[PDB]
Design an enzyme around this catalytic site. Structure first.
Site, PDB file in Angstrom:
ATOM      1  N   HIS A   1      38.912   9.464  73.250  1.00  0.00           N
ATOM      2  CA  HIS A   1      39.279  10.093  74.503  1.00  0.00           C
ATOM      3  C   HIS A   1      38.446   9.875  75.767  1.00  0.00           C
ATOM      4  CE1 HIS A   1      41.616  12.056  71.368  1.00  0.00           C
ATOM      5  NE2 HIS A   1      42.483  12.389  72.310  1.00  0.00           N
TER       6      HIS A   1
ATOM      7  N   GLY B   1      49.142  15.459  71.780  1.00  0.00           N
ATOM      8  CA  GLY B   1      49.426  16.456  72.803  1.00  0.00           C
ATOM      9  C   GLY B   1      48.706  17.733  72.389  1.00  0.00           C
TER      10      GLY B   1
ATOM     11  N   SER C   1      45.175  11.997  67.897  1.00  0.00           N
ATOM     12  CA  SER C   1      44.861  13.265  68.544  1.00  0.00           C
ATOM     13  C   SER C   1      45.608  14.419  67.885  1.00  0.00           C
ATOM     14  CB  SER C   1      45.191  13.198  70.037  1.00  0.00           C
ATOM     15  OG  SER C   1      44.081  12.737  70.786  1.00  0.00           O
ATOM     16  N   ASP C   2      46.498  15.088  68.578  1.00  0.00           N
ATOM     17  CA  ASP C   2      47.222  16.136  67.894  1.00  0.00           C
ATOM     18  C   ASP C   2      48.056  15.509  66.759  1.00  0.00           C
ATOM     19  OD1 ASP C   2      47.613  18.843  67.559  1.00  0.00           O
ATOM     20  OD2 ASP C   2      49.284  18.982  68.953  1.00  0.00           O
TER      21      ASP C   2
HETATM   22  N1  LIG Z   1      48.213  16.909  79.473  1.00  0.00           N
HETATM   23  C1  LIG Z   1      48.706  15.666  79.558  1.00  0.00           C
HETATM   24  N2  LIG Z   1      49.676  15.416  80.443  1.00  0.00           N
HETATM   25  N3  LIG Z   1      48.233  14.684  78.764  1.00  0.00           N
HETATM   26  C2  LIG Z   1      47.289  14.868  77.640  1.00  0.00           C
HETATM   27  C3  LIG Z   1      47.626  14.097  76.386  1.00  0.00           C
HETATM   28  C4  LIG Z   1      46.411  13.298  75.911  1.00  0.00           C
HETATM   29  C5  LIG Z   1      46.490  12.897  74.395  1.00  0.00           C
HETATM   30  N4  LIG Z   1      45.922  13.303  73.266  1.00  0.00           N
HETATM   31  C6  LIG Z   1      46.227  13.943  72.131  1.00  0.00           C
HETATM   32  O1  LIG Z   1      47.298  14.303  71.741  1.00  0.00           O
HETATM   33  C7  LIG Z   1      45.200  14.742  71.349  1.00  0.00           C
HETATM   34  O2  LIG Z   1      45.802  14.690  70.303  1.00  0.00           O
HETATM   35  C8  LIG Z   1      44.886  16.124  71.902  1.00  0.00           C
HETATM   36  C9  LIG Z   1      44.139  16.871  70.847  1.00  0.00           C
HETATM   37  C10 LIG Z   1      43.099  17.877  70.670  1.00  0.00           C
HETATM   38  C11 LIG Z   1      41.849  17.882  69.988  1.00  0.00           C
HETATM   39  C12 LIG Z   1      40.922  18.937  70.176  1.00  0.00           C
HETATM   40  C13 LIG Z   1      41.239  20.003  71.062  1.00  0.00           C
HETATM   41  C14 LIG Z   1      42.479  20.009  71.750  1.00  0.00           C
HETATM   42  C15 LIG Z   1      43.408  18.948  71.555  1.00  0.00           C
HETATM   43  N5  LIG Z   1      44.986  16.727  73.072  1.00  0.00           N
HETATM   44  C16 LIG Z   1      44.531  16.636  74.306  1.00  0.00           C
HETATM   45  O3  LIG Z   1      43.712  15.776  74.520  1.00  0.00           O
HETATM   46  O4  LIG Z   1      44.936  17.536  75.202  1.00  0.00           O
HETATM   47  C17 LIG Z   1      44.894  18.828  75.482  1.00  0.00           C
HETATM   48  C18 LIG Z   1      43.930  19.967  75.138  1.00  0.00           C
HETATM   49  C19 LIG Z   1      42.510  19.756  75.718  1.00  0.00           C
HETATM   50  C20 LIG Z   1      41.441  20.866  75.571  1.00  0.00           C
HETATM   51  C21 LIG Z   1      41.793  22.186  74.844  1.00  0.00           C
HETATM   52  C22 LIG Z   1      43.211  22.396  74.265  1.00  0.00           C
HETATM   53  C23 LIG Z   1      44.282  21.284  74.411  1.00  0.00           C
HETATM   54  C24 LIG Z   1      46.598  11.326  74.174  1.00  0.00           C
HETATM   55  O5  LIG Z   1      46.594  10.812  75.170  1.00  0.00           O
HETATM   56  N6  LIG Z   1      46.692  10.460  73.173  1.00  0.00           N
HETATM   57  C25 LIG Z   1      46.584   9.007  72.866  1.00  0.00           C
HETATM   58  C26 LIG Z   1      46.873   8.918  71.322  1.00  0.00           C
HETATM   59  C27 LIG Z   1      46.820   7.510  70.762  1.00  0.00           C
HETATM   60  C28 LIG Z   1      47.100   7.455  69.274  1.00  0.00           C
HETATM   61  O6  LIG Z   1      47.991   8.184  68.793  1.00  0.00           O
HETATM   62  O7  LIG Z   1      46.431   6.680  68.572  1.00  0.00           O
HETATM   63  C29 LIG Z   1      47.380   8.140  73.663  1.00  0.00           C
HETATM   64  O8  LIG Z   1      46.648   7.225  73.989  1.00  0.00           O
HETATM   65  N7  LIG Z   1      48.588   8.193  74.029  1.00  0.00           N
HETATM   66  C30 LIG Z   1      49.447   7.302  74.864  1.00  0.00           C
HETATM   67  C31 LIG Z   1      48.822   7.026  76.271  1.00  0.00           C
HETATM   68  C32 LIG Z   1      48.554   8.249  77.111  1.00  0.00           C
HETATM   69  C33 LIG Z   1      47.249   8.518  77.635  1.00  0.00           C
HETATM   70  C34 LIG Z   1      47.004   9.684  78.434  1.00  0.00           C
HETATM   71  C35 LIG Z   1      48.077  10.588  78.707  1.00  0.00           C
HETATM   72  C36 LIG Z   1      49.378  10.316  78.182  1.00  0.00           C
HETATM   73  C37 LIG Z   1      49.603   9.156  77.393  1.00  0.00           C
HETATM   74  C38 LIG Z   1      49.686   5.971  74.075  1.00  0.00           C
HETATM   75  O9  LIG Z   1      49.386   4.864  74.579  1.00  0.00           O
HETATM   76  O10 LIG Z   1      50.185   6.069  72.930  1.00  0.00           O
END
Ligand SMILES: N=C(N)NCCC[C@H](NC(=O)C(=O)[C@@H](CC1CCCCC1)NC(=O)OCc1ccccc1)C(=O)N[C@@H](CCC(=O)O)C(=O)N[C@@H](CC1CCCCC1)C(=O)O
EC number: 3.4.21.-
Lengths: 1023, 107
Positions: free
Chosen positions: A708, A880, A927-928
């Protein structure tokens, strides 16, 4: 000073590489360097063809480089030409739609997800006729494709991962190879990430940091005989490429050569190449923020770290005389203004007078300020920081004085009474240390007596406090009026309109003014008494809803309301929330609309001036008395002036400071930060473009060896984003006519889930496309380019089916058709699962754990939950934060039924899965997505099938941007699983049953993972 | 603008926003003085466009010193002597021109 060179390629003695976003060529023999292609946008990859004549180039467009496409360069005639019109989506860490390699015939093989449901599905295609047709290799997702002795070598996810050094998760780079003249075998699967593979002789060279740092390794065509060839320590080497004799690469901004036979490495001497004008012009509005109303109908605002005092017209503009980073500006007097100046050390309060010119700047460090206000009398200011403190800074001396400190979140919602005696604010609190929710209670600090009183109890969320002119009552809002609103699709209810205004009279015995209690029938005149004031609280007779601001006036109340809406656009597209300014007449008790289409609002000190932001993005200002007379605020009259290098140094220091201040583990931060700072700071001066700076910043973020650490937003180019014309169809060049190979459609009755052609009552499949908009397409005319040129409009399309079936329709040419492809894919798998399981198994798929995940999950859950079995497919799940909500449903156990006199059984609970559940997951769920996978196992909801997941579970919630708008992210929220600690981070989740999806599985056209899932469930459904 | 082939540096020297047309591409390089300084020809600070007066560029465009030699298109130096080209730009649009504005050289 020199430049930052990177991403090279070699062919004999010629070496092409990137400098200042453009493509250059250098001759090892003569030693001369020259730019061979420019003004195309941002180039990050250039690959020499076999004959060393043409060059495939990847270029990014759009302000944030969100789009990309490929171009051909011919060094013979200097000809340049665009090859793809896919408008592939890309981000910093997933620069998809690139060159994959070259087949034995010398044909370019690209890797793109343009025609796929998921971005991770960067499938391989062979380019034909400069982009006329694309033939799929059906080898599955791949990043690199190499050919050895007629054998196919495949690199999966083998791109560089600078942002995450030491990555060991499930999406790490791996290399497969062909053996049975059609079958593939995994040959390179180390514990760490493998990138930039190449072959010299009969060995595969690649990079990895299995030993703690990036080095070049190699093995035989069997992944055996591992050898370490380099021992770098300064910077990680990247972008390996070769010509069959020598290997080329870049590191720390320089280009190096590696001779496999000699095992010797040398730095190529290129020297200074380009140094563009440093002093640059920018459009203030593009980077503007913190717009605020001042005295004398003046305006103040911040943009790109600068601050200005101007008239609404933007004709008379004054720039505040202060170095980089002025976070906030606030009215502090007739001609004085207070501001928050940020530096590497922290934030400090400063004062400025746009009349005399004087501008003192205090030294008292306030920490990281996120909110700042000044009393109406201009003697003190109230400030909030990331330490969760709220304090009063003396505007004369500069000495801060902490009032109270929260231990849950920041105290950014506050206000000062007009007589400068009271300070009301929302105070975040929790009943327990491990409490799931954070409450908020309004607190009132009295300057005299210096004591904090409780305005409200601590059982919900009280906010938006506000005092009345006379300073006799404290009005505020709260989400306490509980009332459930029914869900129209799923059995559920939520609190949508539970916001209501309240007031508290500062003088006991004094009644709630909005109550209209006859003065002659009351006996006020009492004296101030803030004790047990939460008991005197009283609601103001205004219907519930969703209020964000309450402004008390003489005989009316202004209320900012936000109508209930969906969150999809806000969660992804980032769309602003639409509100409206409501007026409540205390006398008539009637409510009316003063202004709509608002996305932000600010009120002056004298409560007479209103400054708002509307949905069109423009800022406006109208007098509260006559809202009919609003004017538009212009700021683009005077250009924004800055220095690239000074901003770059500024931006670097902040990115570095944020990475340290927000890292989940405070201990490690102190060491990591101080150890990488200098090393990467010395490259900043080599950065001439935004992209350059990005290369440096991301590499320093990778130093935290954690997930992240992203970089989004910012301005990298003034080029418009690449466009792509889509009608949800797959084209195949057959003969001299393009034929419709496939026509996508999911749920025909849903919106945006099928080729726009279907609306004319015909399936375009098999049909031939004659011409589009009168122009013929086929063996000569690239249909993609044509379509691209009509994107966003309706064009006439002549079609030809079997026999004399001639069609002439006005088809809508879509700008994108990913969702359609996606829904089509889901509905396809749904059909497959139903058919193969003989109608005994349901299917659902969760694309991510955000708003879309919620949509897709319930979209099917309501129809697939009642089968004997259920497959919960979470492959490619981007994460997410709603996994817990999903697990909750799947957790429900069916323990009863409802028997109606007439009708069918109704299961209890309603949202209960009927039978056995199986989960499918791959290395693209993180992530989630990781959380969900792990949880599904732990709770034993069923078997987990697939491949180890991504492995990044350290949440992020950015709260600060870079002067250029860039949004950096820092792994701030470490997820701790019981009986596993943080183990999931940098590893992912192992499925109970591993099922690879080899390149030959794609060739056969079989989904081994979904098939195992079906079969496995059928076996469990025998009992 | 100034280009330096040594470091590939580019930089804008004048901000006169000289007006120009196809046949009168004014505000250009006039020549170089013996000390190696650039002498430009512009009408930016003049009442008439035809008054393309000569100036010596200083400090990359910080200050401009007037040569007060009258309108000129070219300025050359021979043996410490000043050679002046009046209206000596190309006239492709009018071959065989013999009017009063024809190019002339003074010394
Ligand atoms: N609010 C928004 N509009 N956007 C936020 C979303 C970011 C996201 N991540 C994830 O889902 C995580 O699982 C998580 C998980 C965890 C872990 C600990 C605590 C809390 C949450 N969540 C997260 O970052 O967000 C929220 C959160 C933060 C603090 C407290 C409570 C909630 C994530 O981006 N994931 C990677 C996952 C890759 C994988 O699965 O291997 C990704 O690169 N995803 C897209 C590109 C992006 C990048 C950024 C934003 C959107 C899309 C991809 O290329 O597949």
């Amino acid at each position: 000073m020199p430049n930052l060179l990177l991403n090279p390629d070699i062919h004999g003695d010629r070496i092409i590489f990137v400098c200042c976003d453009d493509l250059w060529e250098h001759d090892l023999k003569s030693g001369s360097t020259r730019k061979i292609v420019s003004n195309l946008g941002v180039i990050n990859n250039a690959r020499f063809f076999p004959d060393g004549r043409k060059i495939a180039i990847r270029v990014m467009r759009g302000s944030s480089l969100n789009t990309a496409d490929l171009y051909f360069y011919n060094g013979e005639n200097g000809e340049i030409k665009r090859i793809t019109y896919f408008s592939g989506k890309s981000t910093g860490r997933r620069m998809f739609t690139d060159v994959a390699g070259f087949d034995p015939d010398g044909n370019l093989i690209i890797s793109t997800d343009a025609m796929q449901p998921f971005s991770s599905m960067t499938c391989l295609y062979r380019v034909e006729n400069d982009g006329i047709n694309f033939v799929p290799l059906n080898l599955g997702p791949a990043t690199h494709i190499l050919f050895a002795d007629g054998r196919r070598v495949i690199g999966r996810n083998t791109f560089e991962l600078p942002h995450w050094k030491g990555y060991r998760g499930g999406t790490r780079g791996k290399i497969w190879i062909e053996v049975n003249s059609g079958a593939f075998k995994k040959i390179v699967d180390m514990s760490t990430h493998v990138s930039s593979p190449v072959i010299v002789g009969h060995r595969i060279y690649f990079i990895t940091d299995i030993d703690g740092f990036g080095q070049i390794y190699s093995t035989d065509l069997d992944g055996k005989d591992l050898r370490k060839h380099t021992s770098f320590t300064d910077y990680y080497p990247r972008h390996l490429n070769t010509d069959g004799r020598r290997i080329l690469f870049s590191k720390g901004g320089s280009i190096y050569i590696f001779n496999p036979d000699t095992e010797k490495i040398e730095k190529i001497e290129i020297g200074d190449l380009e140094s563009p004008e440093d002093r640059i012009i920018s459009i203030p509005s593009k980077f503007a923020e913190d717009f605020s109303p001042l005295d004398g109908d003046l305006i103040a605002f911040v943009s790109r770290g600068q601050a200005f005092i101007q008239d609404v017209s933007g004709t008379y503009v004054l720039k505040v005389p202060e170095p980089l980073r002025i976070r906030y500006v606030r009215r502090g007097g007739d001609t004085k203004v207070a501001f928050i100046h940020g530096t590497r050390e922290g934030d400090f309060l400063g004062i400025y007078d746009y009349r005399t010119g004087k501008a003192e700047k205090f030294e008292e460090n306030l920490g990281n300020v996120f909110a700042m206000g000044v009393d109406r009398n201009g003697k003190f200011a109230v400030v909030a920081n990331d330490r969760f403190e709220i304090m009063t800074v003396d505007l004369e001396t500069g000495k801060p004085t902490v009032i109270e400190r929260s231990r849950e979140a920041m105290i950014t919602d506050f206000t000062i009474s007009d007589n400068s005696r009271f300070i009301a604010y929302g105070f975040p609190l929790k009943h327990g240390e491990t409490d799931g929710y954070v409450m908020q209670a309004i607190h009132v600090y009295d300057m005299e007596g210096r004591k904090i009183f409780a305005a409200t109890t601590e059982n919900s969320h009280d906010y938006a406090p506000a005092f009345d002119a006379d300073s006799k009552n404290l009005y505020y809002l709260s989400y306490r009026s509980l009332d459930p609103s029914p869900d129209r699709v799923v059995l559920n209810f939520s609190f949508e309109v539970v916001s209501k205004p309240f007031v508290i009279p500062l003088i006991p015995g004094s009644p709630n003014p909005t109550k209209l209690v006859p003065r002659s029938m009351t006996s006020e005149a009492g004296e101030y008494d803030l004790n047990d004031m939460y008991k005197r609280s009283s609601p103001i007779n205004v219907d519930p809803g969703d209020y964000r601001m309450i402004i008390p006036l003489e005989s009316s109340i202004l209320i900012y309301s936000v109508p209930v809406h969906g969150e999809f656009a806000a969660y992804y597209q980032g769309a602003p929330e639409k509100g409206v300014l409501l007026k409540y007449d205390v006398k008539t008790r009637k409510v009316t609309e003063v202004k709509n289409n608002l996305t932000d609002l600010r009120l002056s000190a004298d409560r007479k001036t209103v400054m708002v932001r509307k949905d069109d993005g423009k800022i406006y200002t109208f007098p509260l008395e006559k809202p009919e007379d609003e004017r538009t605020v212009e700021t683009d009259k005077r250009p924004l002036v800055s220095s690239i290098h000074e901003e770059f140094l500024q931006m670097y220091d902040e990115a570095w400071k944020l990475a340290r201040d927000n890292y989940w583990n405070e201990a490690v931060a102190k060491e990591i930060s101080e150890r990488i700072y200098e090393k990467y700071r010395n490259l900043v001066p080599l950065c001439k473009t935004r992209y350059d700076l990005s290369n440096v910043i991301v590499e320093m973020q990778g130093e935290y060896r954690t997930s992240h650490s992203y970089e989004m937003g910012g301005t990298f180019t003034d080029k418009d984003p690449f466009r792509s014309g889509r009608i949800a169809c797959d084209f195949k060049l057959d003969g001299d006519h393009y034929v419709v190979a496939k026509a996508y459609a999911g749920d025909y009755s849903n919106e945006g889930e099928k080729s726009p052609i279907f609306e004319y009552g015909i399936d375009p499949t098999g049909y031939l496309i004659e011409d589009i908009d009168g122009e013929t397409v086929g063996a000569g005319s690239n249909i993609y380019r044509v379509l691209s040129e009509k994107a966003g409009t309706s064009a006439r399309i002549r079609l030809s089916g079997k026999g004399g079936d001639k069609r002439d329709l006005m088809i809508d040419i879509l700008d994108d058709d990913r969702f359609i492809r996606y829904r089509s894919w889901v509905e396809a798998n749904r059909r497959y699962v139903h058919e193969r399981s003989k109608g005994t198994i349901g299917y659902i798929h969760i694309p991510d754990m955000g708003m879309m995940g919620l949509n897709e999950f319930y979209r099917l859950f309501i129809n697939e939950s009642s089968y004997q079995g259920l497959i919960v497919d979470v492959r490619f799940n981007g994460g997410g934060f709603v996994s817990q909500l999903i697990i909750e449903k799947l957790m429900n156990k069916r323990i009863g039924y409802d028997n109606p006199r007439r009708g069918t059984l109704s299961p209890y609970p309603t949202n209960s899965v009927r039978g056995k559940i199986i989960a499918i997951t791959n290395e693209y769920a993180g992530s989630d997505g990781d959380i969900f996978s792990f949880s599904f196992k732990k709770l034993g909801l069923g078997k987990l099938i697939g491949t180890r997941t991504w492995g990044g579970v350290v949440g992020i919630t950015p709260k600060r941007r870079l002067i250029d708008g860039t949004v950096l992210t820092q792994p701030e929220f470490a997820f701790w699983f019981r009986d596993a600690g943080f183990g999931v981070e940098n590893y992912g989740v192992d499925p109970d049953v591993e099922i690879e999806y080899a390149p030959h599985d794609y060739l056969s056209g079989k989904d081994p993972q979904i098939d195992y899932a079906i079969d496995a469930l059928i076996e469990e459904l025998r009992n």
